[PDB]
Design a binder for this molecule. Structure first.
Ligand SMILES: Nc1ncnc2c1ncn2[C@@H]1O[C@H](COP(=O)(O)OP(=O)(O)OP(=O)(O)O)[C@@H](O)[C@H]1O
Ligand SMILES: Nc1ncnc2c1ncn2[C@@H]1O[C@H](COP(=O)(O)OP(=O)(O)OP(=O)(O)O)[C@@H](O)[C@H]1O
Ligand SMILES: [Ca+2]
Ligand SMILES: [Ca+2]
Lengths: 164, 162
């Protein structure tokens, strides 16, 4: 059931506290700039922004390498800007159901929970994504760590992207 | 906080992920599609506007707090008639309304109020409570909670419906 897709979620770390610190005027400007940054970088990796959730985005890619490259570029850009906003990123792949400009299904929820596990500045991918990129020449992962994900049974191993 | 005054209602399904996993994607998509139509219908009856979806819930704008609360009351009633339990939180304040979206700290606050609600419950912030027996709505005495990202405590009031 559903078409196979790679889902990337972004979320800003402690965005509510940031918004409260800087005030709504500054926040709207910051989030507009951030939206444009994410949108541009997604487009470069032939991805599609499915939707935004205030301080985060759900993004779809056809290939896992595109999702990871996008995450890598986004973290790089955020580091460059910081000269502050930290973003966590999670990537998962599997079948999901399209409805309008949205995605539904357990693999959407799982991608979101993978992102929720990541620290600010970090890109985490699920084991299927790591395995699919086991033979990549430029993408490197740590040895992963075991977590449990809300709503799911059992344990999942999540892998951090190690960028050049 | 900047922008125009708006009433923001959030819904959220309790343990939707576990529910998805138990019944499967086929059944879940059918269920959430049905749920979406129900929420959209009830929102429109109280002159609200769905701003967006957040997977298993919605962000809704109303001009007046009585509209948002009546919507929540009808939604909870409807869900009982129909298992999915929904949390509902309502806040009001100034927000920036740009490109068919709402931005600002009062958006985040409304989300946090909804996250504090029990499944089956409608929680409102103090400003909503204060703005409303003249219009047929009753509340408990409130509970004081901390909300992630905000300093100090906030008194949240449950709607007591017939
Ligand atoms: N434009 C928007 N659309 C939808 N939701 C929004 C919007 N703006 C704010 N929100 C809400 O505000 C909240 C953003 O805060 P979030 O829950 O990510 O915690 P945070 O303060 O970033 O802390 P952390 O993510 O580090 O736990 C979300 O729950 C989201 O629903
Ligand atoms: N179609 C979708 N679009 C966007 N996000 C989705 C979608 N489906 C699932 N999600 C994500 O999965 C999340 C479910 O998270 P939530 O934190 O609400 O968990 P839950 O399983 O409902 O448990 P509880 O709400 O009781 O904590 C959604 O809020 C959203 O972040
Ligand atoms: Ca966040
Ligand atoms: Ca939920």
């Amino acid at each position: 059931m559903g078409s196979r897709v790679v889902i990337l979620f972004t979320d800003i770390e402690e965005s509510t506290a940031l918004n409260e610190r800087i005030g709504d005027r500054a926040w709207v400007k910051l989030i507009s700039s951030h939206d444009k940054l994410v949108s541009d970088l997604v487009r470069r990796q032939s991805g599609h922004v499915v939707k935004s959730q205030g301080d985060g985005f759900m993004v779809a890619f056809a290939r896992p390498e595109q999702a990871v490259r996008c995450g890598i570029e986004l973290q790089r850009a955020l580091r460059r800007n910081a000269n502050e906003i930290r973003v966590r990123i999670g990537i998962h792949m599997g079948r999901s159901v399209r409805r309008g400009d949205d995605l539904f299904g357990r693999n959407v929820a799982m991608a979101a929970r993978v992102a929720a596990q990541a620290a600010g500045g970090e890109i985490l991918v699920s084991q299927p994504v790591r395995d699919a990129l086991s033979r990549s020449d430029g993408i490197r992962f740590d040895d992963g760590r075991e977590v449990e994900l809300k709503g799911f049974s059992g344990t999942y191993r999540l892998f951090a992207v190690l960028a050049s």
